[PDB]
Amino acid sequence: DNMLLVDDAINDDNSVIAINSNTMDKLELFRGDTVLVKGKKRKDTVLIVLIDDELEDGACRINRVVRNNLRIRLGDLVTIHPCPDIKYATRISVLPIADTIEGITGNLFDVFLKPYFVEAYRPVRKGDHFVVRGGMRQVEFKVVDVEPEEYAVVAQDTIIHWEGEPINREDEENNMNEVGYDDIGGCRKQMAQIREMVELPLRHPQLFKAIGIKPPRGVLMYGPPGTGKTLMARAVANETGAFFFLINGPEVMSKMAGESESNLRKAFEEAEKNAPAIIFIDEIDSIAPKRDKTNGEVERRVVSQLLTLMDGMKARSNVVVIAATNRPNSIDPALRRFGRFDREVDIGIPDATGRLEVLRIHTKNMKLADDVDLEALAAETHGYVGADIASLCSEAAMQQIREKMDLIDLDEDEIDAEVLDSLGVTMDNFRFALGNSNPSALRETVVESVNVTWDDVGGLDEIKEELKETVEYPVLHPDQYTKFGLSPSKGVLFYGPPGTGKTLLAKAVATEVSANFISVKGPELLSMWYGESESNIRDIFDKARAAAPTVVFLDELDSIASDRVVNQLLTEMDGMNAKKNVFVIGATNRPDQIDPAILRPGRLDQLIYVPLPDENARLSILNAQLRKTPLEPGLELTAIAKATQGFSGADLLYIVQRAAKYAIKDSIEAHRQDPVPYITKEHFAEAMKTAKRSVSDAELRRYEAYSQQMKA
Amino acid sequence: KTATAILRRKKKDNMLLVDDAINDDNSVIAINSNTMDKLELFRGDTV
């Protein structure tokens, strides 16, 4: 309860805090004694306390400048401590800021020396920012150095130094050394995992000694490029507050032989000296790539030196190693063994909420126009990693500049600020920028979340119940199976007509158990067979393990039944431990090319037939499609449902699409010559007249015969 | 339409047309008094 609520202060004094007597009573503080106020992200200050009975109990009085220095907002909670070790400063060095001295020249140091420090005894601390009035300006300076440590008080006898040059303000902000949790969004799970893996060894090492265990050291986070891995590592390191020493893979690999070993040895030794510390790496694959493809001696010696350093790490030392790599399996396998990088973390493409949070964070400084619907942008952006969102914001701003530049002339070296006042990004600019982006993460197998529920499935109730019993129960009821000893099945294979709603069932099942869906289309398997694709099925299953629980989906599994990929899939699937929350769902419209070994126990043994939707199912699917496009009042879909015997969900969707296209064409013609913002009966009549069936009756007979034979 | 906005240059009065001079003077250039009046130019001042 000692935490006190931050309250806005009208007075601008930078070293005075006015509080009610009850505030002192709670902490038993004494009048005339400075106090230490600590906020967030290792920010603290020392202030002289005053008694102000007007302020209500628990309400403080700190000027906005001090709150800005502490990096806190109004109404926040700050910890208050006494200052029994109050000390005065002997030598303090401070330098000015150039942008703060614009409009007035001369040396204001002597001007401010006496008036602002005439026995004031204002407490000072490293990095403090204080504003003093000179001439017609209010100039703010920073506390470059103070001695003796740690904070001290500004006494008259203190010697003030001002020999130096100005330093910009925004330069400190852009240093990137100060980025808290507030600068990251959409990675709650990964952020929590990293915090629990790093903080505990460093912040509270005594726990492991109490329980008698060697704390883990090797942490390895991997994900698609431009996903924020470096930003997350930097943020967690700054939050911890331990000494941080980064190593860039490209930098280390860029120096002649021997120099790299020297750099690594020096970095490791220095980190050991300053425990607690955290060692971070970038593109660890570059320095220690797969050996089968790079047989050079240089990479071998570098990776061996790294392994020796990792092994030589002492038992008791607050040091944690982190690494980043785009491909989890590209790095040399030797680093994945016990006593090395073992705590693996997977970062996937953020979902709608994650994209919304990232977009909110990035667009916190731009002059957004009046109409901004970031929710819609998040909904449209599917498969966008954070870097692409930043690029989108930059491109939209550039488009706004293009729109507004014609007013100004670029030949003149000066641009009127009144024009700048009008700068603002409109929704159309964001639409255009979204049109001119180039997402690339989605093009490869990446774990992403899905939010499809059973409602979106038009029927197949029996299949729903059977799949629930097969999969969902052991996920949340393992104790029952352990008691009865029955092992849980994993391999479920859907067979039936194409476009009958299989991927949707897989997504629904994945969403049921709150697991990360993974999609691997047949062309990807074919490319892996040809070897062109960088990824390998080993990588797919490793990511699935690291992101457990997960649902892997194999679309068009018959396309590879190629024998090498079949054998590799069999080996990986069988080697998987059943108790793990990993499930494989296969899809195929030709349940004949599949090799018999695929149907063995402990593999894709469960077979599920997918029938064509019934009239009720077709009606439900039609209702599902028509959610955002308005319809003619009184429209009846029963005729459409009854007239679509033998149709598939995809065929009905195509019918809806062509009807909507006809409606839009009619609207365009009417506008040329929005009186019709919806569809009417005539469009559906046209569509049904243009109807067909993607599956012939002979195929239905074949599937029915196969299903009956399987049943028998 | 607007993607080429930067390329075009806004028009302004100070830009003037080029023609071969009747006289042979090099450091001396002559303009109509109307141009000086629009630009408030006078005699005795270099350009």
Ligand SMILES: Nc1ncnc2c1ncn2[C@@H]1O[C@H](COP(=O)(O)OP(=O)(O)OP(=O)(O)O)[C@@H](O)[C@H]1O
């Ligand atoms: N929450 C976030 N998640 C992802 N990217 C973010 C986030 N917030 C900001 N960014 C942007 O993402 C980039 C930071 O991630 P970065 O590109 O360094 O990741 P990376 O590709 O994993 O890094 P590395 O170079 O170490 O391999 C910057 O553009 C930053 O602006």
Ligand SMILES: Nc1ncnc2c1ncn2[C@@H]1O[C@H](COP(=O)(O)OP(=O)(O)O)[C@@H](O)[C@H]1O
């Ligand atoms: N129960 C269902 N049966 C058939 N189609 C459905 C069902 N539920 C939804 N759909 C629709 O059918 C489409 C199926 O697309 P797709 O996944 O390409 O075919 P399939 O699922 O047969 O592989 C989806 O766009 C979806 O809107």
